[PDB]
Amino acid sequence: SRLDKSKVINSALELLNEVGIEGLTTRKLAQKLGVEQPTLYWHVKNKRALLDALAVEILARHHDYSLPAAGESWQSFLRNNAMSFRRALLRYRDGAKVHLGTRPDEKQYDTVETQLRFMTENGFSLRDGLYAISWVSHFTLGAVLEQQEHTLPPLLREALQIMDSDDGEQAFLHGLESLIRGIEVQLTALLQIV
Amino acid sequence: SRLDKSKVINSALELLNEVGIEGLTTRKLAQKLGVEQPTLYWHVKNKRALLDALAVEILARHHDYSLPAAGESWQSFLRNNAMSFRRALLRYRDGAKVHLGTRPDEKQYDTVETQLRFMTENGFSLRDGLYAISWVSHFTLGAVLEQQEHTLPPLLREALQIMDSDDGEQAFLHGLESLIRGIEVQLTALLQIV
Ligand SMILES: [Cl-]
Numbered sequence A, B: 001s002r003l004d005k006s007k008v009i010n011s012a013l014e015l016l017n018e019v020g021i022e023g024l025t026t027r028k029l030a031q032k033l034g035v036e037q038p039t040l041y042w043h044v045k046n047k048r049a050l051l052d053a054l055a056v057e058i059l060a061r062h063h064d065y066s067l068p069a070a071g072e073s074w075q076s077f078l079r080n081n082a083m084s085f086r087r088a089l090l091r092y093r094d095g096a097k098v099h100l101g102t103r104p105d106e107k108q109y110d111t112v113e114t115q116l117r118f119m120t121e122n123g124f125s126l127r128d129g130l131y132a133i134s135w136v137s138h139f140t141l142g143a144v145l146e147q148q149e150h151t152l153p154p155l156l157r158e159a160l161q162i163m164d165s166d167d168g169e170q171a172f173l174h175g176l177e178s179l180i181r182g183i184e185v186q187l188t189a190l191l192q193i194v
């Protein structure tokens, strides 16, 4: 049963959705592919290897806003990128955990390099351009991991009603906007005292 | 060998540091406590139960800045709280993952209720006071999970030198300051167009 790299990964992504990050094993993947374990091992040595491949493909398939447009503002870049990252992570079960668990890839540095060039051309130091992107990343990952994880007193109750209703999109977008404005302030200040 | 709730949890925290969140099992905890598995089961029914207990204790022991001081500014509250949360999570291996994986506790709502009362007294709606605290939380969790997880092109290189050197404290504190300023802007705007 076809053991092309593409086909292994695809069967693995399907499996990820059935069983989650814990449950997913090479033993279960071979059963799925209709193939003996030593035959799969020839192709995929371990779970670590499999997960790395998965982490790269999820972004390859869904993370479509990774490079800025022509003449785009840094603010809009960071907003579109984070929106894109977020939906790429929400696409598969435990998707955020798959991303957390893997060292970055030899395309992810090339794309991040254009991203960081873009930031330095817009007034960001380099450490600062790196930080700004890290922070948006951290914020988005944290927001997704709590959304993907989770399926008394009066005030907590009373503000619940937007905890449910919306999936987390409004809360996420409000906070992303807050974070980008804060990074603006620091940037434009240069520094007089801010 | 003493099976007090306190003593079980403490042995579990030690074990958490040895084996991490995956490795930790009830079977391994019983071996540690010098006790047969059915004897442990009387006290702790499953891993889910154990992890819940651990998640609450880590914050009970280390999260010391969970309530504002007398006359404290909302900004300073959010900054001290997040600093405190962060160090509480960095204290045990996979500490951030233990927190992610558990529904909140019947003290965590009472303390969050005072926190949210505090925010509404400082001009925050309620949904907004809740969001502000959620976002700081998300940012801190994301920052910690990437620090606890992780133990080519020219610009990426050249800004690495503060990736190492510091542990993540400077980056974290710069971004927390950015995020709080952004939340200020939105708050003080009320809204004229911001
Ligand atoms: Cl075939």
Ligand SMILES: [Cl-]
Pocket: B001, B002
């Ligand atoms: Cl004893």
